[PDB]
Amino acid sequence: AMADLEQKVLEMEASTYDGVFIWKISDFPRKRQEAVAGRIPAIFSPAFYTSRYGYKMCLRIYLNGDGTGRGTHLSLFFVVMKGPNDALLRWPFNQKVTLMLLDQNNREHVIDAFRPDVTSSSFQRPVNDMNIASGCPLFCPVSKMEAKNSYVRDDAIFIKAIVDLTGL
Amino acid sequence: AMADLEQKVLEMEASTYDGVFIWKISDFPRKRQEAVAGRIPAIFSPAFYTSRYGYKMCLRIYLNGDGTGRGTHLSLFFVVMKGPNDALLRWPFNQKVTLMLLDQNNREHVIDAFRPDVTSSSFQRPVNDMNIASGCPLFCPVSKMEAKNSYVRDDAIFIKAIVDLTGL
Amino acid sequence: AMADLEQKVLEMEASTYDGVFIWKISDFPRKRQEAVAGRIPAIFSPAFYTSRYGYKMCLRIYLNGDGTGRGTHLSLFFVVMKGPNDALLRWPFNQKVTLMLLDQNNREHVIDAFRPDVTSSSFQRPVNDMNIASGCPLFCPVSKMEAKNSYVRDDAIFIKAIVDLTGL
Amino acid sequence: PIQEE
Amino acid sequence: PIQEE
Amino acid sequence: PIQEE
């Protein structure tokens, strides 16, 4: 429980309740390699919410790609998680989601956005701890970031997510 | 201390600082019986505040009634607690309080509201950890909730409190 | 780790993310003596931020004075700390900072303000855990506070900081 | 409001 | 959106 | 502002 409690504190420390989340991934080179080697294919981010008692969500990233992006792109997905107040929320989840890889020189951020596929299993009320992740398989070419550029600085990158609150 | 610190974490986890609080009571059936049997007549909710450094408050509920509602109603009361910044606040507490039992079918929520009785000890600056609770002894008939209806779902209910911030 | 985790919880408990911070210093008399005797000249406050992912800051106070205020004044300083998202922020730190000693009779607060000295090492991007503190060495004469007045009440004082968010 | 008994 | 594989 | 000594 001592370590279990530390995990709760860490999660609380990262949570946000306004639909905006900035995910800092440090030790980039090491994690990048664990992905290339297949030892650790993906990483889940801490959870964040649309409001104090809104939808619970997180992100999932494949530093060496998933599906159509395997081995060639950084794949980034959105995840709807089972939240404590799901019974009070409207389903399926239907908020626009914006995903970004921040340029640490504020020159040119990588950005993409999508509206949920209402008929998809990914956006129905969660029965399990998490629904299947959905998003961008070809979010960013491995050469784009990683290599040089200004996305990786001091061995860390920043991923940003913005969940539109229209209707909430 | 191991468990004392765990309590601090849970309190922090549930705290809000905008005067709005939603209290989820799980294991409704069991807690309901413990009340009827008189083993656990009342339950306190975690604390919440009117602002980052405002009044500290919490709720207290009697699942099988208190006073005039004993044995027949769900009794819900408001509680002014001793806060860290009480010295900087105006007293007695005089903010309107709205209390609700949420209908998990958003059809018809149970709602009531009151303005503090400025002469009651319940709203003076706290000398003890908490003042005498004050509120609605006849908030909701045990027959309305519990039984069937849409208030209890998956063995849980949601109580909501809204503290008006006019003047703060 | 047991005590180390207790520390993290306390910091989180005090953190704010809107540039406004109220620091309550209890057991004033004792800490005042520890300062006069030279055992504990200064005290750091918990950390706070300009926004969810903004600059990380804290305050440092010398209850019996520092430099030009040594032995005669309460000295209060501002501190720019190394924050987790400094790579995404503009440097040097250049927000206006307002510092106050609150009158617990709301009659007349002690107030002062300043704009960062852009050429000072105190406002450059942190390389260490904390930059050198900078602020008001002659914030409040010891006689004004302490002694009598309405700043010290029930052996505690309240310090307030307001970081202007223009441009952020 | 009415106080709890 | 495209689901992860 | 003035630095602490």
Curated annotation (Swiss-Prot), chains A, B, C:
E3 ubiquitin-protein ligase that regulates activation of NF-kappa-B and JNK and plays a central role in the regulation of cell survival and apoptosis. Catalyzes 'Lys-63'-linked ubiquitination of target proteins, such as BIRC3, IKBKE, MLST8, RIPK1 and TICAM1. Is an essential constituent of several E3 ubiquitin-protein ligase complexes, where it promotes the ubiquitination of target proteins by bringing them into contact with other E3 ubiquitin ligases. It comes from the Eukaryota. It is found in: Cytoplasm. Homotrimer. Heterotrimer with TRAF1. Heterotrimer with TRAF3 (via TRAF domain). The domain containing the RING-type and the first TRAF-type zinc finger can also form homodimers (in vitro). Interacts with TNFRSF1B/TNFR2. Interacts with TNFRSF5/CD40. Interacts with TNFRSF4, TNFRSF7/CD27, TNFRSF8/CD30, TNFRSF9/CD137, TNFRSF11A/RANK, TNFRSF13B/TACI, TNFRSF14, TNFRSF16/NGFR, TNFRSF17/BCMA, TNFRSF18/AITR, TNFRSF19/TROY, TNFRSF19L/RELT and EDAR. Stimulation of TNF-alpha receptor TNFRSF1A leads to the formation of two distinct signaling complexes. GO terms for cellular component: CD40 receptor complex; cell cortex; cytoplasm; cytoplasmic side of plasma membrane; cytosol; IRE1-TRAF2-ASK1 complex; membrane raft; nucleoplasm. The chain holds residues 334 to 501 of 501 of the full protein. Belongs to the TNF receptor-associated factor family. A subfamily. Keywords: Acetylation, Apoptosis, Coiled coil, Cytoplasm, Isopeptide bond, Lipid-binding, Metal-binding, Phosphoprotein, Repeat, Transferase, Ubl conjugation, Ubl conjugation pathway, Zinc, Zinc-finger. The coiled coil domain mediates homo- and hetero-oligomerization. GO terms for molecular function: CD40 receptor binding; enzyme binding; identical protein binding; mitogen-activated protein kinase kinase kinase binding; protein kinase binding; protein phosphatase binding; protein-containing complex binding; protein-macromolecule adaptor activity. Phosphorylated at several serine residues within the first 128 amino acid residues. Undergoes both 'Lys-48'-linked and 'Lys-63'-linked polyubiquitination. Can be polyubiquitinated at several Lys residues via 'Lys-48'-linked ubiquitin chains in response to TNF signaling, leading to proteasomal degradation. Autoubiquitinated, leading to its subsequent proteasomal degradation. Polyubiquitinated by BIRC2 and SIAH2, leading to its subsequent proteasomal degradation. The keyword Acetylation applies. Its main location: cytoplasm. This is TNF receptor-associated factor 2. It comes from Homo sapiens (Human). Residues 18-163 form the MATH domain.
Swiss-Prot record, chains D, E, F:
The chain holds residues 262 to 266 of 277 of the full protein. This is Tumor necrosis factor receptor superfamily member 4. It is linked to Immunodeficiency 16: An autosomal recessive primary immunodeficiency associated with classic Kaposi sarcoma of childhood and poor T-cell recall immune responses due to complete functional OX40 deficiency. It is found in: Membrane. It comes from Homo sapiens (Human). It comes from the Eukaryota. Receptor for TNFSF4/OX40L/GP34. Is a costimulatory molecule implicated in long-term T-cell immunity. (Microbial infection) Acts as a receptor for human herpesvirus 6B/HHV-6B. Interacts with TRAF2, TRAF3 and TRAF5.
